[PDB]
Amino acid sequence: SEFVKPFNNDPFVGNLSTPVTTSTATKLYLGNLPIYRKGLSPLMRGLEVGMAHGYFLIGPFYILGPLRNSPNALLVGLFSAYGLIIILTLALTIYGLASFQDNSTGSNLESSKGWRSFTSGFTVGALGGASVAYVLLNNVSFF
Amino acid sequence: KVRVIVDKDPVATSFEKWAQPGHFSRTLAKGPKTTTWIWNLHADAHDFDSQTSSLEDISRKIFSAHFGQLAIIFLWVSQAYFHGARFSNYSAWLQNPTAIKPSAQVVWPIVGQEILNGDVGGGFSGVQITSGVFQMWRASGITNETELYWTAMGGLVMSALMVFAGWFHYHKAAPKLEWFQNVESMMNHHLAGLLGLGCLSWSGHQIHISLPINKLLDAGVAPQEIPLPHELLFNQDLMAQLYPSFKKGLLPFFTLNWSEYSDFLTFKGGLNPITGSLWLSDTAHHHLALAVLFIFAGHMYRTNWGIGHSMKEILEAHKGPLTGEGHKGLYEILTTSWHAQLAINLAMMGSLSIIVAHHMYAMPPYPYIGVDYPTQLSLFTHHMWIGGFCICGAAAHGAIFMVRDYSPVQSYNNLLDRVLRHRDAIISHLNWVCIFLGTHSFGFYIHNDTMRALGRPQDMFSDKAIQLQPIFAKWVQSLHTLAPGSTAPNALATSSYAFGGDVVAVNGKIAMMPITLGTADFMVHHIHAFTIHVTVLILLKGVLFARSSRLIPDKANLGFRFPCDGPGRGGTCQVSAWDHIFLGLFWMYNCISVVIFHFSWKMQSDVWGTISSSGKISHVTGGNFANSALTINGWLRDFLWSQASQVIQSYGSALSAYGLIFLGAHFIWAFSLMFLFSGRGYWQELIESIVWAHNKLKLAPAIQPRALSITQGRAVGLAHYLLGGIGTTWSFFLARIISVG
Amino acid sequence: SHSVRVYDTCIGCTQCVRACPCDVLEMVPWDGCKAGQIASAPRAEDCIGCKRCETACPTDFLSVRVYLGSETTRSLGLSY
Amino acid sequence: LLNLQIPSPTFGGSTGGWLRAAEIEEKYAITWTSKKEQIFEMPTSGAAIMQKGENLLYLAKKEQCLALGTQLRTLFKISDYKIYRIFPNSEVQYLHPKDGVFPEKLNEGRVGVGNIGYSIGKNPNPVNVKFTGKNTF
Amino acid sequence: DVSGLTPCKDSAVFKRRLDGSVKKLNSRLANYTEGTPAYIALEQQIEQTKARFAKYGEKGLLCGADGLPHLIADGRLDHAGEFIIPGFGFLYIAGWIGWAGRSYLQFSKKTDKPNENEIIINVPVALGMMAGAFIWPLAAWKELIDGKLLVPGDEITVSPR
Amino acid sequence: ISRGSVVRIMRPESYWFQECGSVATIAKGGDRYPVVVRFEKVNYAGVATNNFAMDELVEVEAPPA
Amino acid sequence: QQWVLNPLKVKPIAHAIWDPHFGQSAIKAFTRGGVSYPVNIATSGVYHWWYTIGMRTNEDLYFGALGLLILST
Ligand code: CLA
Ligand code: CLA
Ligand code: CLA
Ligand SMILES: CC1=C(/C=C/C(C)=C/C=C/C(C)=C/C=C/C=C(C)/C=C/C=C(C)/C=C/C2=C(C)CCCC2(C)C)C(C)(C)CCC1
Ligand SMILES: CC1=C(/C=C/C(C)=C/C=C/C(C)=C\C=C\C=C(C)\C=C\C=C(C)\C=C\C2=C(C)CCCC2(C)C)C(C)(C)CCC1
Ligand SMILES: CC1=C(C/C=C(\C)CCC[C@H](C)CCC[C@H](C)CCCC(C)C)C(=O)c2ccccc2C1=O
Ligand code: SF4
Ligand code: SF4
């Protein structure tokens, strides 16, 4: 009872159709993640990715930062998250500039306009997510 | 049917092929034209599979070569026993083991080297030994030198017998491949016959000769008044006076009243308070139980009678959905190829040597070996090094099997084929594991160094700033400490005192003590894991990509060891599985060096030392591991720089030999870098200039000199590197431990 | 791509073409050699530069010679 | 040129196949004929079964194709192998047995390329070709 | 006297070194009893140490401020035994070795199988060459005069310049 | 030069440049390098023979009689 | 200027340290040379060279730096 078969019935492609690669759970989770979800605009993809990453980026800096044992621990963590997000979106912009040099299609992550929209969504979402995480950690007594 | 079939007089006994050096190899049989012929002779000396094509002849050669190796090993055991008999202070040490330093080597006075005959006590001058053979013989019950002399003579007789057997089984009566391929009968005889009867005979020896002599010695009887073993063997009255259960005879054995032998067959555990070692009654019970286990195990496989298993069917029955045909074909592979068997056996031998190292220090088996700190360190380090070497040999011979004896016809769709078909995924995932593990583990050390240098101890990964506690190791230690009451009710004490319990001490020195784990232990263990993982990455990549790769689709055609495939494709340097082994030997060297350094520092800081009457525990280095092992600076300062004093300050004393070997090992390690960094083209051009200089005086040799091959240069560099490193650590550890302990 | 050249010291042994793993070399008729053939490199763009031709060449110095030069995907032999 | 519908060898798949570059820069194909169905070793890691009659295989390198051709020639004595380069435009270029016979056999239709009229050690020095676009060969 | 050094006979530091070595052995001597092999061996050690120091004093070696012998190698015959006499001895022995090797190579090449003659030495004639190399300085001069020591210059390969 | 003779090589790029070698065969007609000189000193590749032109060889010892 | 008065005791200063990774202990340890901030002790002999050729005040060094800047321009 074989469970590892050729990828898309192609023995000569460098891949295997394992349970990890091809199972229904993997397909569902991957295809429903924002980067692969159907119908989402590049702005919406970038926005979702941005809030998801900016929400959790604050935590390492807040807990394990140099000023963890200081009254300004959370503020310093938020500023660190903002700086890291600035670096991340600068990386995104230069990546778009290097990769999608000539393009006129748009509405596609592999085009200049689409990648710019994705980066804009990522920046706004990450800033908002870091701010929301700051608010939650300030009001941690609620939970 | 399993039967004996041999060929009579398959080879003639003559010196003509002694005179003809390269007789074995087709290419070398012609004669020398360059100095590379000389190197190729030694390189291809024992490559029987390349020399011939008959598996029968290869098996016969291997069998008689094993006989020669056994002869050498018997000569080595003879040297140990004879030097103990003749050139040693074993009698004085037996009379007073704690005070007398064991020594069994004496140097002649020629160039002032007689200073090496240091003061070892007992009115004897010689070189202190660290092999533990004295404690071994004390456990065995040898109390006089005539016994050592006679067992040495017996070992010489056995070595001569092994040489004769090796001659006989190649030149007079050589077996057949059908005889060799009886793996089921071989396993039956090695389980029940070799291991089972070996354990049974050793248990009998212990029960009859070792328990009485050792018990009397621990009581206080000096060796002169000890009854001789031949007296103890049959004198049941004396054995009953010592162990009362012996008066009941063998009826409590034949009837199943085995509890009657509880006195001399115990389950006490722990360490004997007198000798600070394992109970010999426990050892005898252990070996007897193992003899029963192995004799039971050895009746599994089929032979001339109907009963029994077959490994072919056992393998072929084990197949799953995610493995296709499963283990089909592996029986044929392991019956036809010697290299696959060599790989598996070397891997297990090396891992077993490492396990031996880990067990012997924690549970000192021989009397007065725990207090003999040089012996413990020496044995642990030695067996760790042997284990690493054997594991890399396992990888190398697996690669050799892949290159030579692999064939898809027999392995279509079995586990070997399925592993080759996703080697890329395997190696990429192990690569990620290596990067993650190394980054985190070494970045802990680098972060700690940076914080200490910046004057921020509160930001360290220390036991009091940011704790990385080994919760699972501590939990396992707690379980093993509570085991003798709850989960091992018949055991009175723990298996080892390292997990916890009392502090066993003989005289002042501490034999064993609980080993506490903390942040430094967490860091160094994850460093061990990272090093092992990178070594496995290199070796496994070499084995998997032995056939071919994305860079060279026809790597198998070139061979097992070949220099390269030219500067094309950007450079195909060290693409061979041989070169992968060459790179992995550096990495196991790094791994084992870090392991032995961890062992040495941890034991000198936290176990070894002296305990006073009031209970004050004073360690060799003073428990500095827990706070100084957190940084590479602390490793450099408090371990290397601090403990190199006993080596560098050794001149003019008995350890001056250790100082000289320290410097010489450093020299050889540095010398190796010439071969490791340089290349053959430079040396060939330099040799051309020198050959011109010789031709000018009309003495250029007929055998034209050549620079060493690329593979040979790599091998020479690796060999010198390993020799220099291991010698440096050898001299350093021996000088330090002999001086302080 | 690398530059493959063949000099008139060739002796038509056809061993360079056999050692060739990329079909870069082929025998063509010639007058100078007694075997009536000479190695030639009409497909130098497929050359990778492993110099198996040079290794297999039995002349005192190499009739077939490869000069490494501009790198390409084919010359680097990248499957990706 | 090439049928693109020949049955391929039976193979269970591998990770040594083409990865995102053969489908965008160039792929390679090798087609041969076998007298019996039989097991062979792929240039990529694994064991495949070449079918009875015609067989077609895909690869990522001319080196891989030539290695498989050599394997077929010196193990199964199949010398009917022919190799093609397939571009993303689906242009097919028949490459290895260009004249219909292997390079080792001599044919009169081949013209010398890269043949020099003097011995190897008579090339000009680098100083002669300094500040010029030519080379010393 | 040369370079501010003094003879080791009138060298207080040299005498102090001798007494220190003697006192170190005699101390180590306390562990062992009279008449034992180790005791007599240590007595030999002390006697050899004293003999070495006396011989070094008598030989006229110069002892520096550190109290150790210093060898003068400039050509002065007052200290010929340090370098000049051992130097000539080594030169004679080394030329003997080189001449034996060269003459054996000259023989072995003329043989039908020189390659096998190099790795399997014809000992009966090799011993002859080792013996005959005792007179190498005259033999070397004779071969040089006869033009048989040096191979001419354009009969030896040389690479492309 | 001639069959059975000993000739010194003068090709600059040869491993046996300015070394003697025994002539084994001279090819007539074509064969830009017709002489076939055989040596007892193997080169780096391992071959002990090579083809040479007339002008690349210098006569040093005529064949036997 | 302080080093000029007592060359054999005052340690010359190369430049100030600005490092937000330093701890309080690091700042205290690197505060040396008779100044109130962390510094590096020069090991190039530039102080000795300038004192020998005749520089006596920070103004002379500053004007030399300006001249060298104009020369580079
Ligand atoms: C790799 C080892 C290592 C580790 C574990 C740490 C850890 C730390 N360092 Mg650093 N450090 C290191 C190496 C390391 N260091 C080295 C090599 C240096 C020398 C240059 C330094 C120098 C240094 C300084 C100078 C300082 C630190 C500090 C710190 C702390 C906070 C750093 C921070 O803000 O991180 C931010 C980290 C992140 C934003 C992300 C980390 C990665 C995330 C958690 C991974 C999650 C993966 C996830 C499971 C993937 C799958 C998810 C999927 C299933 C959904 C922290 C204790 C600071 C401190 O105060 O120390 C107490 C500080 O001042 N370090
Ligand atoms: C059971 C043990 C075992 C056996 C039977 C073999 C058998 C073989 N190995 Mg080996 N091998 C082993 C263990 C073993 N190996 C281990 C532990 C390693 C890991 C290091 C290797 C790694 C290895 C490689 C990488 C290769 C082999 C190869 C071979 C084959 C040829 C070896 C030969 O002719 O050497 C003849 C003996 C010599 C050339 C002398 C070696 C001298 C060593 C390098 C130095 C010794 C130093 C000395 C102990 C200390 C000097 C001190 C100083 C102060 C003077 C042969 C089938 C080769 C092959 O082609 O296999 C098919 C090959 O390439 N083996
Ligand atoms: C100190 C010397 C040194 C160093 C630093 C390395 C480093 C490495 N070797 Mg090794 N190697 C060495 C000596 C060394 N080697 C020698 C002498 C040899 C010859 C025998 C080899 C031969 C060799 C082979 C053959 C292989 C390696 C591999 C590796 C990698 C292991 C994976 C890993 O943990 O990466 C992580 C990096 C490190 C452990 C280095 C220090 C990391 C610190 C903590 C910083 C990390 C954080 C951050 C990213 C960077 C810091 C900030 C920066 C921006 C300023 C790694 C890059 C293996 C590999 O590539 O596996 C994937 C491998 O196959 N090495
Ligand atoms: C799958 C899975 C997993 C994982 C998980 C994860 C990965 C998670 C994550 C999570 C997260 C990571 C989350 C996040 C969240 C976020 C949020 C919730 C956010 C929000 C935001 C907001 C709301 C914003 C706002 C704004 C904007 C947008 C802009 C402007 C400003 C403002 C502020 C207005 C595990 C391992 C468990 C296992 C099982 C499975
Ligand atoms: C006196 C003296 C001195 C001086 C010295 C000198 C100055 C020297 C010089 C020297 C020199 C300047 C030399 C030269 C040489 C040259 C040449 C050119 C050589 C040659 C040789 C040869 C050729 C050899 C050969 C041989 C023989 C004869 C034998 C053996 C073998 C052989 C073959 C090797 C001093 C001060 C130190 C001090 C001490 C004393
Ligand atoms: C130093 C070095 C050499 C030079 C070494 C050579 C030519 C071989 C040296 C072997 C010697 C001859 C072994 C014996 C040394 C004895 C001390 C010589 C005296 C005994 C004679 C009778 C032979 C290489 O050829 C080389 C090649 C490839 C990578 C690295 C290197 C490399 O590092
Ligand atoms: S140095 Fe050796 S391994 Fe490296 S490219 Fe050259 S021949 Fe190949
Ligand atoms: S010399 Fe080289 S190019 Fe000429 S025929 Fe021989 S292998 Fe081919």
CB contact under 8 A, B424 and A14: yes
CA gap B468, C5 in Å, rounded: 64
Chains touching F, CB cut-off 8 Å, 3+ pairs? B, C, D, E
**Nearest partner of C33 among C62, C7, C54, C3, judged by Cα:** C7
Distance, CA of B500 to CA of B481 (rounded, Å)? 6
Question: What backbone phi and psi angles, to 5 degrees, belong to D59?
Answer: -150, 175
Helices assigned H by DSSP within B44-196? 48-51, 55-86, 90-95, 133-140, 145-171, 177-180, 183-188
Q: CB neighbours (10 Å) of residue D70?
A: 17
Distance B434 CA to ligand 1 centre (A): 18
Looking at chain C, which residue has its C-alpha nearest residue F53? Answer: C9
Please give the torsion angle defined by the CA atoms of residues B562, B567, B569 and B575, in that order, rounded to the nearest 10 degrees. Answer: 20
Whole-number Å distance, alpha carbon A77 to ligand 4 midpoint, is 17
Residues 6+ apart with CB under 8 A from B675: B713, B714, B716, B717, B720
Of C11, C58, C61, the CB nearest to F14: C61
Contact present, B150 and B97 (Cβ < 8 Å): no
Structure tokens that stand for A43 in this block: 């702005």
Q: Rounded distance, CA C68 to CA C5, Å?
A: 11
Residue of B163, B156, B190, B158 lying closest to B67 (CA atoms) = B163
- Read off the DSSP letter of residue G66: H
Ligand nearest to the CA of B684: 6
How far away, in angstroms, is E68 Cα from ligand 1 center?
A: 60
Q: Which residues lie closer than 8 Å to B605 by C-beta, 6 or more apart?
A: B619, B620, B621, B622, B623, B624, B625, B626
To the nearest whole Å, the CA of F11 is away from the closest chain D CA by 9
**CB burial string D108-133: b at 16+ within 10 A, e below:** eebeebbbbeebbeebeeeeeeeeee
CA nearest B243: which of B217, B215, B285? B215
Q: Flag whether residue B34 sits within 8 Å of chain F, measured between CB atoms.
A: yes
Residue F26 DSSP SS3:
strand
What are the Cα distances from residue B653, in Å, to B25, B87, B260? 51, 21, 56
The 3-state DSSP class for residue B635 equals helix
- Category of B517 on φ-ψ map: left (φ > 0), alpha (ψ -120 to 50) or beta: beta
How remote is the C-alpha of D110 from its chain's centroid? 19
Distance CA B437, CA B533 (A): 9
DSSP SS3 for B272: strand
Q: Is the CB of C19 under 6 A from ligand 8?
A: no
- Measured over the CA atoms of residue B68, residue B69, residue B75 and residue B78, the dihedral's sign is negative
Q: Which one of C59, C60, C61, C65 would you pick to mutate in the ligand 8 pocket, going by the greatest count of ligand atoms within 8 A of its CB? A: C59
Which A positions 69-88 lie with beta carbon below 8 A of chain B? 69
Which residue type occupies C3? S
Mutate to test the pocket of ligand 3, among B523, B534, B672, B721 (most ligand atoms within 8 A of CB): B534
- Cα distances (angstroms) measured from residue E96 to each of B690, E91, E128: 21, 8, 13
Q: Are B623 and B605 in contact (CB under 8 A)?
A: yes
Give resolution in angstroms.
2.7
- Judge whether B420 and B547 are in contact, CB under 8 Å: yes
Tell me whether residues E151 and B695 touch, CB distance under 8 A.
yes
Comparing CB atoms, the residue among D60, D104, D120 nearest residue C65 is D120
C70's tokens: 């501009």
Q: C-alpha distances in angstroms, A5 versus A30, B372, B423, D48, D58?
A: 20, 60, 16, 14, 17
Interhelix angle B519-544/B423-453, rounded to 10 degrees, is 150
CA distances for F39 relative to F7, F16, F20, angstroms = 10, 8, 8
Amino acid at site D87:
F
Query: Cα–Cα–Cα angle for B111, B114, B115, nearest 5°?
Result: 110
| Residue B119 β-bridge partners | B125
Torsion of CA B343, B556, F42, B16, to 10 degrees: 40
The token pair that represents B389 in the structure block? 């070497």
Dig out the tokens for E152 from the structure.
């001419």
Percent composition of chain E: helix, strand, coil (DSSP 3-state, to 5): 70, 5, 25
| CB-CB under 8 Å, D12 with B324 | yes
* Option in C50, C75, C76 nearest B566 (CB): C50
Q: How far apart are CA B367 and CA B93, in angstroms?
A: 12
Q: How many CB atoms lie within 10 A of CB B53?
A: 8
Residues of D in contact with A15 (CB under 8 A): 13, 15, 17
**Which of B447, B466, B523, B530 for a ligand 1 pocket mutation test, highest count of atoms within 8 Å of Cβ?**
B447
How far does the CA of residue F41 sit from the closest CA of chain C (Å)? 12
Q: Do the strands B617-619 and D92-94 form a parallel or antiparallel pair, or are they unpaired? A: unpaired
Cα torsion through A70, A75, A80, A83, rounded to 10: -150
- Name every protein residue with a CB atom under 6 angstroms from any ligand 1 atom: A 57, 60-61, 64-66; B 439-440, 443-444, 446-447, 450, 459, 466; G 21
State the smallest CA–CA distance between residue F26 and chain E in angstroms: 24
Distance CA E37, CA B123 (A): 9
C-alpha distance across the termini of chain F, in Å: 16
| Per-residue DSSP letter, B238 | H
Give the closest-approach CA distance of F43 to chain B in angstroms: 9
β-pair type (D47-50, C37-40): unpaired
Which pair of structure tokens corresponds to residue B620? Answer: 């060799």
Centre of ligand 1 to C-alpha A65, Å, is 9
How far does G43 lie from chain B, in Å, by closest CA? 21
d(CA B102, CA B87): 11
- Residue B46's CB is within 10 A of a number of other CB atoms, namely 13
Q: How many CB atoms are closer than 10 A to CB F44?
A: 14
Six token digits for residue D109 = 């239709």
Strand partners, G38: G31
- Cα(B708) to ligand 6 centroid in Å equals 7
**Rounded CA separation B508/B371 (Å):** 9
What long-range pairs does B326-333 form, CB within 8 A, spacing at least 24?
B326/B414, B326/B415, B327/B414, B327/B415, B328/B414, B329/B410, B329/B411, B329/B414, B329/B416, B330/B414, B330/B415, B330/B416, B332/B410, B333/B401, B333/B405, B333/B410, B333/B411, B333/B416
> Residue B320's closest CA among E118, A86, A4, E59?
A4
Closest CA to B187 of B293, B302, B84, B102: B302
Instruction: Please indicate if any CB of chain E lies within 8 Å of the CB of F18.
Output: yes
Nearest Cα residue in chain D from C23: D96
3-state secondary structure of B325: coil
Stretch 568-607 of chain B: residues touching chain C, C-beta under 8 Å: 568-570, 572
Residues of A in contact with D14 (CB under 8 A): 11, 14, 16
**Set of chain D residues whose Cβ sits within 8 Å of the Cβ of A13:** 13, 17-18
φ, ψ (nearest 5 deg) of residue B623: 60, 35
Pair B276, B368: CB distance under 8 Å:
yes
Q: Any idea of the CA torsion for B315, B317, B321, B326, to the nearest 10 degrees?
A: 20
Q: How far away is chain C from the Cα of B26, in angstroms, using its nearest Cα? A: 20
* Listed residue (B424, B22, C36) closest to D13, CA to CA: B424
CB distance B713 to ligand 7 below 6 Å: no
DSSP B401-425: HHHHT--TTT-SSSHHHHHHTTHHH
Q: Please tell me if residue D12 touches chain A, with a CB cutoff of 8 Å.
A: yes
Question: Among residues 1-30 of chain C, which lie with CB inside 8 Å of chain B?
Answer: 2, 21
Q: What are phi and psi of B609, to 5 degrees?
A: 155, -155
Helices (H), B607-709: 625-628, 632-635, 642-643, 645-648, 656-677, 680-696
In terms of residues, how long is chain A? 143
Chains that touch A (3 or more CB pairs under 8 A): B, D
**What type of residue is B543?**
V
Token duo for residue D59: 């690869």
Q: Using a CB–CB cutoff of 8 Å, tell me whether B424 touches chain E.
A: no
Q: Which amino acid is at B505?
A: A
Residue A13, strand partner residues: D18
A56 lines ligand 4 (CB under 6 A): yes
Name where chain D breaks: residue before each gap, C-N > 2.5 Å.
none
Contact present, B568 and C77 (Cβ < 8 Å): yes
| CA-to-CA separations, B299 to B4, B314, B331, B405, C2, in angstroms, rounded | 20, 15, 19, 31, 66
* Chain B residues inside the 8 Å CB shell of G28: 455
Cα–Cα nearest to F39, from F10, F11, F6, F61: F6
Nearest CA residue ID for atom 5, ligand 6? B707
Q: Tell me the C-alpha distance between B595 and B358, whole Å.
A: 11
Q: Which amino acid is at D119?
A: S
Q: Residue F46: left if φ>0, alpha if ψ -120 to 50, beta else—which one?
A: left
Q: Are strands D115-116 and C3-7 parallel, antiparallel or unpaired?
A: parallel
Say if ligand 6 is within 6 A of residue B715 CB.
no
B292-296: list long-range contacts, CB under 8 Å, 24+ apart.
B292/B196, B293/B196, B294/B191, B294/B192, B294/B195, B294/B196, B294/B199, B295/B191, B295/B192, B295/B196, B295/B197, B295/B200
Amino acid type, D113: V
Distances in Å between the Cα of B685 and the Cα atoms of B38, B679, D109 are 20, 11, 43
Q: Does D112 touch chain F (CB under 8 A)?
A: no
Burial of B275: CB neighbours in 10 Å, binned 0-12, 13-18, 19+? buried
Which atom belonging to ligand 4 lies closest to the Cα atom of A131? 33
- Tell me which chain A residues have a C-beta less than 8 angstroms from the C-beta of D55: none
Q: Which two tokens stand for residue A77?
A: 């963590």
Could you give phi then psi for residue B8, rounded to 5 degrees? -90, 125
DSSP state of A13: B
The CA–CA distances, whole Å, from B144 to B87, B88, B375, B652 equal: 13, 12, 22, 34
Atom of ligand 8 nearest to the CA of C39: 3
Ligand 8 atom at minimal distance to the Cα of residue C12: 5
Residue with tokens 């009659």: D53
